[PDB]
Each structure stands twice: as structure tokens, then as C-alpha cells.
Design goal:
- The complex is a heterodimer of chains A (about 230) and B (about 210).
- Chain A has about 230 residues and is mostly beta strands.
- Helix content of chain A is about 0%, strand content about 50%.
- In chain A, the strands form four sheets. In chain A, strands 2, 4, 5, 6, 9, 10 and 11 form a seven-stranded mixed sheet that branches. In chain A, strands 12, 13, 15, 16 and 17 form a five-stranded antiparallel sheet that branches.
- In chain A, strand 7 and strand 8 form a beta hairpin.
- Chain B is mostly beta strands and about 210 residues long.
- In chain B, strand 5 and strand 6 form a beta hairpin.
- Classes of the chains: A mainly beta (about 230), B mainly beta (about 210).
- The structure holds chloride ion.
Chain lengths: ~230, ~210
């Protein structure tokens, strides 16, 4: 099945160039589609950036950005890409790739049936910082009988995002990862908690797997009772 | 661009119609308007294309129409799950594309729910770095509004607090968190700290101590 998968740096310095790529699977980039980019500045609406046409490579861009935008295809790799030059804080947004599908353009136009997952790009002169991860030792009082809550605190990272799993993704039931808080320092923090059987404590190991791709850092933090 | 109302609000089980006013060069130039649903933090999802067509897997509760240069999305039998931003969009003459500004849908009438409050003390290791973060995790409440007050030995703490805006959980209730950032010296100089969460006139207070 058709899938669009986005990748690219989530941190760009002002006046530098933003680059993203959209890897297509389940179909050919050479087919009759308008391979498109769309963005969404924080708390604002969707904004069209432009497209490249799969069968010929013709492009068209939003005139608000036509000066700064380049959209390209790499037929090997089955991908298309976005380059946005001379960025400013106004370009901070979630960027989406999407497939524009059509029948007869002059009668019905086209529409976006498949979408990439979206990549947040932050335009900032602040530098990348990896998180410090701290265990939150089990606490039984706020959970059901025979269970306890334990977690890990992911402190002081930049930029977003961080993802958390437990026991390498083998533990999924009862997991709750909370949205990040933004500190006055400009750094983010979040917490992830999981509710586990009180019986299992001491015998079963619990490890939170914290991934911060923007700093190419992963931390696997074991969580145990305090001593 | 394409003009949508910033918000609409209706109650559970009701219908709602969202308008999208464009021009004869887009909505009125083609049978080509499409509609997208976007939940916070996820990609837009196609609901309607070619004015009124639904992709397979989209609920028949969604329908679309147009009259002149205005398109309309109607959602029947409103559920909590339908709360989202809704966008219209269309091809426009001259080989371009335009989105509407988006409409945020609020669905009222959902049941009240009190928050669960989970409060963790600082870890040994953070303390060795002369820092102490108290973590107050607030979950399963509705509506998505809470007030958090931190206390040290019962007296109000105002400095060093950061509290998130509530966000929907998969079960359509809300979650938020509050952090109190202290020094280790501050942590060790009080008998206790408390996170007090107030919601709909009721308060849950949890306490932790250096022990
Ligand atoms: Cl607790």
C-alpha cells in the first residue's frame, strides 16, 4: 500500500536552507501524480508550497515562496524533496508531503489522498541539546489495587521531538507518554509513565527507551525502587 | 483564500455544517473541492473529494455539497471523536492550490471526569546535580481545564512552575502535566511539597517528601 515517509533535519539556522525528503513506497514516483509539499506554521492553517509532476518533472510553487522554493525528484530512491532557502522564524512549521491525485484537471482539479507523517522544522540559532533521563521510581498510591506507576523524566532537550518506548516496545499496555513542557530556558521536558503489576516489581526489569533523533541520542534508563 | 468560520460548536448527536467560501476560479470553477480532518499532532486526513465523494473507510456521517462559490461539509451524529480542525481545499485556475483557513469543531455534552493525579519526587541522580524536579502528571479529566497550585510546607510556591495546556488522550479525556523546578537545597529544606489540582470546584492534593 502507498506510504509517504518524510525525513530531514528538524533544526535549521536562520538564513540557511531547509531540506526535506519524502520517500514513496507502494507506487512509482514516475507516475501521474502531483507530488506536493504543504506546511503548517504553529497555530495556523495549512499552506500550499508547491508540487512537482511525476511524469515530466514540471513544477509550480506558491508565489509567496516561488523565490525560495525548489522541489525535485530522485527516481532512484523513489523520492521527492523540498529545499527552502534563506529561512527565517516565519518558516518554522510542520511540513507535509502529499500525493495529488487527479482524473481530469480542467473539470475536477485534484486532491491529496496520501500524506506524509509531517516533520516539525524549527528555525532557530539555538544549538541541539540531548536530554538527561531520570527514573521515576514506582508509586502505588494513585493506581488500581495490585498495580504501581513508574516512569522516566526526559529533561532539557532541544529541539522537539522525543519518543519513548518501554522494554524495547515489548511493553505497551498502560503506557502514557505526556506532551512536552517548554521551559523559559528554551529547552523541553516530558515524562512517560507506565502502570505495572505490583507483583512484578523487583523481578521484572523496566527500562524506558528514550529517542532524541535530533541529537542522535538514545537513552535506555532502568527504573527501580529507591534506596 | 478560501474562507471558513474559525470555529463551530454543537452537542453530541447533533449535525453541524461547515462552510467554505471561495471564488469562481476554484470552488465555482471546478467540481474539485476536497475536505480534510486534522487531529492535533497528526497529518490531515482526506474526508471528501470532488465536492461530495467519500473515500472508502470514511464514515457516511461525512457529506459534502456546494452552491455557487461556497462549499459545505456536513457531519451528522456528532461524537467526541469528531473534534478536530477541518479544512477545505481546491485547485485554482493557473495551476495552483488553495486551502481554507480551517474550522475548529467543539463537540459539547460530553461527561465530566475528575483528574487522576500522580506526583513523583526527584530522583537520587538529579539531586546529585544539585537540581530537583517534581513531576505532577494529571490525567483522565473532562473538560480540558485544570488549575494547579504548588505548595511547600503548605505555603504557596509561585517561582519555578511550568504547566502544560491540556491535550486529548486516545480515550477523549484530557491530560496535562506540571513541573516544579527546584535546587536540591530547596528540596531538602522543606518537610514536604504538594501538587494541588483543582477541576470543577474539587481539588486533589498529592504530597511528596525528601524522606
Ligand atoms: Cl502518585
Amino acid at each position: 500500500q502507498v506510504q509517504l515517509q518524510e525525513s530531514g533535519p528538524g533544526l535549521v539556522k536562520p538564513s540557511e536552507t531547509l531540506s526535506l525528503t519524502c520517500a514513496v513506497s507502494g507506487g512509482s514516483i514516475s507516475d501521474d501524480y502531483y507530488w506536493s509539499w504543504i506546511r503548517q506554521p504553529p497555530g495556523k492553517g495549512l499552506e500550499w508550497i508547491g508540487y512537482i509532476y511525476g511524469s515530466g518533472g514540471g513544477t509550480n510553487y506558491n508565489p509567496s515562496l516561488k523565490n525560495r522554493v525548489t522541489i525535485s525528484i530522485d527516481t532512484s530512491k523513489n523520492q521527492f524533496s523540498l529545499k527552502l532557502s534563506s529561512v527565517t522564524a516565519a518558516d518554522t512549521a510542520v511540513y507535509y508531503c502529499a500525493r495529488g491525485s487527479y482524473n481530469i484537471v480542467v473539470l475536477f482539479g485534484y486532491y491529496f489522498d496520501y500524506w506524509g507523517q509531517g516533520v516539525l522544522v524549527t528555525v532557530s540559532s539555538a544549538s541541539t541539546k540531548g536530554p538527561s533521563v531520570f527514573p521515576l521510581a514506582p508509586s502505588s498510591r494513585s493506581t488500581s489495587e495490585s498495580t504501581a506507576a513508574l516512569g522516566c523524566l526526559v529533561k532539557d532537550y532541544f529541539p522537539e521531538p522525543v519518543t519513548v518506548s518501554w522494554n524495547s516496545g515489548s511493553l505497551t499496555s498502560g503506557v502514557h507518554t505526556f506532551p512536552a513542557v517548554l521551559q523559559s530556558s528554551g529547552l523541553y521536558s516530558l515524562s512517560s509513565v507506565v502502570t505495572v503489576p505490583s507483583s512484578s516489581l523487583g523481578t521484572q526489569t523496566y527500562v524506558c527507551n528514550v529517542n532524541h533523533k535530533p541529537s542522535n541520542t538514545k537513552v535506555d534508563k532502568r527504573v527501580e525502587i529507591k534506596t | 483564500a478560501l474562507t471558513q468560520p474559525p470555529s463551530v460548536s454543537k452537542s453530541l448527536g447533533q449535525s453541524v455544517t461547515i462552510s467554505c467560501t471561495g471564488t469562481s476560479s476554484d470552488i465555482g470553477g471546478y467540481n474539485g473541492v476536497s475536505w480534510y480532518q486534522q487531529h492535533s499532532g497528526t497529518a490531515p486526513r482526506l474526508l471528501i473529494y470532488e465536492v461530495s465523494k467519500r473515500p472508502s473507510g470514511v464514515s457516511d456521517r461525512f457529506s459534502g455539497s456546494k452552491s455557487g462559490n461556497t462549499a459545505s461539509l456536513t457531519i451528522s451524529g456528532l461524537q467526541a471523536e469528531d473534534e478536530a480542525d477541518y479544512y477545505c481545499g481546491s485547485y485554482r485556475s493557473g495551476s495552483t492550490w488553495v486551502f481554507g483557513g480551517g474550522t475548529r469543531l467543539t463537540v459539547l455534552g460530553q461527561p465530566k471526569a475528575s483528574p487522576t493525579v500522580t506526583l513523583f519526587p526527584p530522583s537520587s541522580e538529579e539531586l546529585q546535580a544539585n537540581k530537583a524536579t517534581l513531576v505532577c502528571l494529571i490525567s483522565d479529566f473532562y473538560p480540558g481545564v485544570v488549575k494547579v497550585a504548588w505548595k511547600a510546607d503548605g505555603s504557596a510556591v509561585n517561582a519555578g512552575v511550568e504547566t502544560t495546556t491540556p491535550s486529548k488522550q486516545s480515550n477523549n479525556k484530557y491530560a496535562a502535566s506540571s513541573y516544579l523546578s527546584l535546587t536540591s537545597d530547596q528540596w531538602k529544606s522543606h518537610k514536604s511539597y504538594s501538587c494541588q489540582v483543582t477541576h470543577e470546584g474539587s481539588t486533589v492534593e498529592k504530597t511528596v517528601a525528601p524522606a
